[PDB]
Amino acid sequence: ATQRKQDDIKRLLASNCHQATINLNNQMKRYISHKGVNGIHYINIEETWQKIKLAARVIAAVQHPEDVMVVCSRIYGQRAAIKFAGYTHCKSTSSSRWTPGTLTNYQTLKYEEPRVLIVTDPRSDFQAIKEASYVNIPVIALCDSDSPLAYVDVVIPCNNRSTESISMIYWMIAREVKILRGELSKDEEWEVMVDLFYHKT
């Protein structure tokens, strides 16, 4: 608990990143702290923080950022993740329609060959993960309690339901990646509001 870390957990809490649906894929058993009277499943936030940083370290690791690929289906993380790709200089799946064959078929128009893949809802984005499975491509996923971890290498426990949550997760990851890349000081605050990544109605 530095002031930095306290700011991190405060941001995470405020964004309500720790609220999950009621199903537990048992694969998630380890990431979930509390099970409420109202059935709400509550995530340990420390795990979230840790995993965000780990992820950032995986992304810093790929030499050339365009070999990292963010994939999102839902409407919330469209905005957030396109902004993410924006600051992170990586590739975005914009069209919510992921074309079967995108990773597998060298003949497709959307054809990509990332070194690392990042998905917003393993459950929604599943086809992407399945394709990554055919290519030897590792995956960082944003993961709710209901989400399958099959073929997922880095789990960041989140609430991938809300805009607030998803957006500030992609945000925090981006900021930490910036830091690791020396595009930003470790001590310095980032002038980009989280509010950008929110999905406007």
Partner 1 sequence: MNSGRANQRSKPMTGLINDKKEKIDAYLPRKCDWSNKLIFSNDQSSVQIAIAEVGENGQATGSKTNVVLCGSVRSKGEAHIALENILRERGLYPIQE
Partner RNA sequence: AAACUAUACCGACUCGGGAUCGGCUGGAAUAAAUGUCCAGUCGGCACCGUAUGAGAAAUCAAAGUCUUUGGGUUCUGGGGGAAG
Q: Note the residues at the interface with RNA (CB under 7 A).
A: 24-26
Q: Which two tokens stand for residue 98?
A: 């992921």
Q: Minimum distance from CB of 68 to RNA (Å)?
A: 23
> Among residues 11, 24, 27, 112, which is the contact residue for partner 1, using CB under 8 A?
27
- Phi and psi angles of residue 26, each rounded to the nearest 5 degrees, phi first: -60, -25
Q: Minimum distance from CB of 35 to partner 1 (Å)?
A: 20
Those residues with Cβ within 8 angstroms of residue 45's Cβ, 6 or more apart along the chain or in another chain: 9, 12, 13, 17, 18
**Per CB under 8 A, which region of 14-22, 68-76, 81-89, 130-138 contacts partner 1?**
130-138
- Is residue 51 within 8 A of residue 59, CB to CB? The reply is no
Q: Minimum distance from CB of 166 to partner 1 (Å)?
A: 19
Closest CA to 121 of 12, 20, 16: 20
Q: Does 9 bind partner 1 (CB under 8 A)?
A: no
Find which of partner 1, RNA, none residue 193 binds, CB within 5 to 8 Å per kind. Answer: none
Q: Which two tokens stand for residue 145?
A: 């309690």
Find which of RNA, partner 1, none residue 57 binds, CB within 5 to 8 Å per kind. Answer: partner 1
Q: Does 71 bind partner 1 (CB under 8 A)?
A: no
Helices marked H in 15-109: 45-61, 76-88
Count CB atoms within 10 A of the CB of residue 75.
Answer: 11
Residues that bind partner 1 (CB under 8 A): 1-2, 4-5, 27, 30, 50, 53-54, 57-58, 60-62, 133-138, 148-155, 179-182, 185-186
